[PDB]
């Protein structure tokens, strides 16, 4: 096919956990879907203590933004590495086929840009991440990862082939950080990336994250940034982990339909309490809220959730159903 005969549509990305507007069921034939991302190296405070790291981001956030296309669209990414950055970067899409997912074709030094195109031949949610040869885990675990959703052209289906339509979608990126520590246990600090590299490697080799966070920091998805829904709304939560296993759980709810390893040609698992998303994968869970109130959304290694940071909240509006749950006798002497 002459790709130049296809429609082009430019997407304007949004910061996680929000997701750019899209159609679940494709309203057009295949398209070339145009995205641009600008790499930003920046300092980020990641915990309540004020611990500050040198993050490596796509488009200024950890995680990078969720990209959404349909199966057999073409993804055309302009990747910009401004001269205000100091490292070489690239991008690997797990959705793509060939050239290490794109990494072999997208190496950009500061002051360079590149444009990659690939055909999104398989439906699912997929990780994307930076992957410069010899320095891969350092870039990934500095926050340089996100996800892409490739919807089936006729949207999502349940285990019986009937439609599933979400009302809202959120993208939760989970990030394991490995902040080097001195022998006494305090975080070290470093003056340039090259002076940091050996201690970064040492810290990674412990296989013990110092922080595990959603949307780039402890508490990022709480308070005025809690996720929201109403009773009766259908919500899809896309969750990715580019480097390490996680086990998401909606405290007070379920995954009514879960693609734990993220690939929509497979039937979803029903009624999950918790599911395993392997490191290097994106998963997706569909839930219809039935009760109002505060929910916690966590990695259900509860240490990882409540001591290391892998916990967010939903605030859900609506009516309470006492048939589904009630306090018969409130706590009393």
């Amino acid at each position: 096919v002459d790709i130049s005969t296809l429609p082009r549509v430019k997407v304007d990305l949004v910061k996680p956990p929000f997701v750019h507007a899209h159609d679940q069921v494709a309203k057009t034939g295949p398209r070339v879907v145009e995205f641009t991302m600008t790499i930003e190296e920046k300092k980020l405070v990641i915990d309540r203590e004020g611990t500050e790291i040198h993050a490596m981001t796509f488009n200024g956030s950890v995680p990078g933004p969720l990209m959404v296309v349909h199966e057999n669209d073409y993804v055309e990414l302009r990747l910009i590495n401004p001269d205000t950055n100091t490292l070489l970067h690239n991008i690997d899409f797990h959705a793509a086929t060939g050239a290490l997912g794109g990494g072999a074709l997208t190496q950009v030094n500061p002051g360079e840009e590149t444009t990659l195109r690939f055909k999104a031949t398989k439906p699912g949610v997929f990780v994307y991440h930076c992957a410069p040869e010899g320095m891969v885990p350092w870039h990934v675990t500095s926050g340089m990862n996100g996800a892409i959703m490739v919807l089936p052209r006729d949207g999502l289906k349940d285990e019986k082939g009937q439609p599933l339509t979400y009302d809202k979608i959120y993208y939760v990126g989970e990030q394991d950080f490995y902040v080097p520590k001195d022998e006494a246990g305090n975080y070290k600090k470093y003056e340039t990336p090259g002076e940091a590299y050996e201690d970064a490697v040492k810290a990674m080799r412990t296989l013990t994250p110092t922080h595990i966070v959603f949307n780039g920091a402890v508490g990022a998805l709480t308070g005025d940034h809690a996720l929201t829904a109403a009773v009766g709304e259908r919500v899809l939560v896309v969750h990715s982990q580019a480097n390490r296993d996680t086990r998401p759980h909606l405290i007070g709810g379920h995954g009514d339909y879960v693609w734990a390893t993220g690939k929509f040609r497979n039937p979803p698992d029903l009624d999950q309490e918790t599911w395993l998303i392997p490191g290097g994968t994106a998963g997706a869970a569909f839930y219809t809220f039935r009760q109002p109130g505060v929910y916690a959304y966590v990695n259900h290694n509860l240490i990882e959730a409540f001591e290391l940071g892998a916990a967010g909240h939903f605030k859900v509006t609506g009516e309470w159903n006492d048939d589904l749950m009630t306090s018969v006798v409130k706590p009393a002497s």
Copy 2:
């Protein structure tokens, strides 16, 4: 519905790995199934060395007892925290919907009780655990967790829709403990829970259990407490892990039908050697014994099994089948 028009049935719980009597296929319409549990803080010796911890239990055991109901029954739990305990506790059921699984409605100080009711709308095995705000992993990893089984009203089914009926059922709760260590590696000790809390947190944050045990102690499911079966018997083993991944394996057997993430509306996985139960989940495996003798039932991280405690035994009675396995030439020079 007026729940007061429904039958009430009081269950009398039993200590794991045994399971209270129940019917696989529901012999009545929906019921309110009444349970009572009394929280007990107690010292427990967990290994052969004599290491003693301050455990936090439901009904005196680690794990707490298995509760069994059918889909769309109501679970009505009276939870008692006697004044001989010193901490605040609550309960979260992963089977339930709303109020963080019940935790937001069941906070009981010593000397208090409460009664919670919820509708068991989804079939499967599910974790329950204590979850007091700000102290969640400490209570869970002190042993304060168990499981609940919500059977389909017409019992279990295989991947083709035909019945699966177990002859025996056992509940294996697997517990990761994080016993604080001094720099030399010996377990520390503490005089009150509040004096222990910071070191407990420190120990948890290593993400490295000091002990991983079945039924509350190294060797608990061995010797005179080994699990038992006969050749030809159909056995369901429910396995839960409230905080950390495990990978069960019957040494010498298989999981003929496994719901690794525990939810019975999904078809089981067939012929598993090993399966992954994510932390925060209950799973269930169905096996028909074909050979007599000693079996080991383990977490198949064999370090976790044989060095940290996650190993039990079956003793199986009956005839040996030499067609299925035989020593053709016994070991010899």
Copy 3:
């Protein structure tokens, strides 16, 4: 049945990642398939630094060789422990039923041999490993493990029941090693196995591998030992991990059909980016190559891959498809 009336076929094993010749669809009725393995304790250099360990092998390799039979064949293994070895060994097949998978019947001291027969009643890929009572994880994590493939008699099938036929097969054994370290972090060394045992146990109990490798060493499946394919070829990659979870990923490709927990009566998962093989399991992934070039095949904990050793390469010959992927604008200022 009188097994003595069945055909006997002797297999001549090959060193991983290659696999002995076999038929996907069975060309005969059930057979007794005869294998012989000779245990070899040997020194192995496992990393680029020259770190040398005392490995425990089946047939001289880590992993041991892949054995291939069909469902309801009998596997008859002659296991030889020459008098040039110093330890007791045995074998457990996860494919087998009874006697701890064979371990209770195959204990051989140096200078002894034994012959075990079992019926391969369940199709799938399965782990085999040494398992001497009281010393199990030490033998396994010294490299004493491999896998066996039990093919359905009519070969592999997709999720719809139509045939899947591979053109090439490779066996990737992934090994976690626990090389004891001194307080400063250097690997220790030891003069006999018994003098090594306590420090080996200590090192294992950290649950933190020092090395995680494919085919027995860092870089073993790279360079002149890279895996190979051509565009359009259908490749099955069998992957095992006898002790610890892994999450394989073909960088630049997919698992088109994956049996993550290895058992062929289940439908495969489609279009996987990454899958979880639990410790104690073998899995298998089927892929049809669509692009030429270098691929990396990794455990997608990228620390485990690129810093600890769990990475190999494919070199794929053929035509580049610019419709599937192209650089629209190569990197430039």
